[PDB]
Enzyme design. Structure first.
Site, PDB file in Angstrom:
ATOM      1  N   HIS A   1       0.736  -1.254   0.000  1.00 11.64           N
ATOM      2  CA  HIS A   1       0.000   0.000   0.000  1.00 11.64           C
ATOM      3  C   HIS A   1       0.761   1.296   0.000  1.00 11.64           C
ATOM      4  O   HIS A   1       0.131   2.350  -0.198  1.00 11.64           O
ATOM      5  CB  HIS A   1      -0.905   0.020   1.267  1.00 11.64           C
ATOM      6  CG  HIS A   1      -1.798  -1.178   1.332  1.00 11.64           C
ATOM      7  ND1 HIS A   1      -2.773  -1.449   0.385  1.00 11.64           N
ATOM      8  CD2 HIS A   1      -1.836  -2.195   2.214  1.00 11.64           C
ATOM      9  CE1 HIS A   1      -3.405  -2.574   0.713  1.00 11.64           C
ATOM     10  NE2 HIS A   1      -2.858  -3.038   1.830  1.00 11.64           N
TER      11      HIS A   1
ATOM     12  N   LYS B   1      -4.319  -9.930  -7.849  1.00  8.01           N
ATOM     13  CA  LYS B   1      -5.034  -9.493  -6.613  1.00  8.01           C
ATOM     14  C   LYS B   1      -6.195  -8.616  -7.103  1.00  8.01           C
ATOM     15  O   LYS B   1      -5.994  -7.675  -7.862  1.00  8.01           O
ATOM     16  CB  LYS B   1      -4.055  -8.667  -5.778  1.00  8.01           C
ATOM     17  CG  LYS B   1      -4.452  -8.686  -4.325  1.00  8.01           C
ATOM     18  CD  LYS B   1      -3.643  -7.699  -3.489  1.00  8.01           C
ATOM     19  CE  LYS B   1      -4.276  -7.637  -2.103  1.00  8.01           C
ATOM     20  NZ  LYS B   1      -4.000  -6.345  -1.403  1.00  8.01           N
TER      21      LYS B   1
ATOM     22  N   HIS C   1      -2.914  -3.774   8.106  1.00  4.14           N
ATOM     23  CA  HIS C   1      -3.975  -4.172   7.147  1.00  4.14           C
ATOM     24  C   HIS C   1      -4.709  -2.955   6.645  1.00  4.14           C
ATOM     25  O   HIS C   1      -4.942  -2.016   7.412  1.00  4.14           O
ATOM     26  CB  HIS C   1      -4.875  -5.141   7.928  1.00  4.14           C
ATOM     27  CG  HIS C   1      -6.242  -5.308   7.356  1.00  4.14           C
ATOM     28  ND1 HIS C   1      -6.479  -6.012   6.171  1.00  4.14           N
ATOM     29  CD2 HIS C   1      -7.461  -4.860   7.795  1.00  4.14           C
ATOM     30  CE1 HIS C   1      -7.778  -5.959   5.883  1.00  4.14           C
ATOM     31  NE2 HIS C   1      -8.393  -5.289   6.861  1.00  4.14           N
ATOM     32  N   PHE C   2      -5.038  -2.897   5.345  1.00  5.00           N
ATOM     33  CA  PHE C   2      -5.774  -1.752   4.798  1.00  5.00           C
ATOM     34  C   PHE C   2      -7.263  -2.165   4.806  1.00  5.00           C
ATOM     35  O   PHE C   2      -7.596  -3.073   4.055  1.00  5.00           O
ATOM     36  CB  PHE C   2      -5.403  -1.355   3.387  1.00  5.00           C
ATOM     37  CG  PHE C   2      -5.900  -0.002   2.950  1.00  5.00           C
ATOM     38  CD1 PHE C   2      -7.157   0.134   2.398  1.00  5.00           C
ATOM     39  CD2 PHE C   2      -5.117   1.124   3.104  1.00  5.00           C
ATOM     40  CE1 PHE C   2      -7.658   1.373   2.053  1.00  5.00           C
ATOM     41  CE2 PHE C   2      -5.627   2.374   2.773  1.00  5.00           C
ATOM     42  CZ  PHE C   2      -6.874   2.486   2.210  1.00  5.00           C
ATOM     43  N   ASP C   3      -8.098  -1.505   5.609  1.00  6.77           N
ATOM     44  CA  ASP C   3      -9.508  -1.907   5.680  1.00  6.77           C
ATOM     45  C   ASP C   3     -10.394  -1.242   4.653  1.00  6.77           C
ATOM     46  O   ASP C   3     -11.087  -1.918   3.862  1.00  6.77           O
ATOM     47  CB  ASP C   3     -10.036  -1.683   7.103  1.00  6.77           C
ATOM     48  CG  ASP C   3     -11.235  -2.552   7.413  1.00  6.77           C
ATOM     49  OD1 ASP C   3     -11.116  -3.780   7.305  1.00  6.77           O
ATOM     50  OD2 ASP C   3     -12.304  -2.041   7.747  1.00  6.77           O
TER      51      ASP C   3
END
Length: 124
Positions: free
Chosen positions: A12, A41, A119-121
């Site tokens: 990210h 992805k 983590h990218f939510d």
């Protein structure tokens, strides 16, 4: 392998650019970040702010994650981001993505010591 914080950074972080400039940004970045390696992805967001500014979100507004955990944080201000989404026509190993540049709050899950993004939510 790769630690959880290192993996978040590789998938990210893109501080070298202020924003995506062409519709080709996602196809190039997904590839150079080795995110189309075993498969394509489906969705991935790139953040164009410094690592320190993104790390600072772990001390901002505490909200629930999409999974129900409560170690998620929402940035108080908007940030420059690029959403990369596979097109309906994309097929491994010929991955194709749609690039959408925008300015919005990011939500990240944090953990460890130091407490950093892992983590990218979502972006809102």
């Amino acid at each position: 392998k790769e630690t959880a914080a290192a993996k978040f950074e590789r998938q990210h972080m893109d501080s070298s650019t202020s924003a995506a400039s062409s519709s080709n940004y996602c196809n190039q970045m997904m590839k150079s970040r080795n995110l189309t390696k075993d498969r394509c992805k489906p969705v991935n967001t790139f953040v164009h702010e410094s690592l320190a500014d993104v790390q600072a979100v772990c001390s901002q507004k505490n909200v629930a994650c999409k999974n129900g955990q409560t170690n998620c944080y929402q940035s108080y201000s908007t940030m420059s981001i690029t959403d990369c989404r596979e097109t309906g026509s994309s097929k491994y190993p010929n991955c194709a993505y749609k690039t959408t540049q925008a300015n919005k709050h990011i939500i990240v899950a944090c953990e460890g010591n130091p407490y950093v993004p892992v983590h990218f939510d979502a972006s809102v």
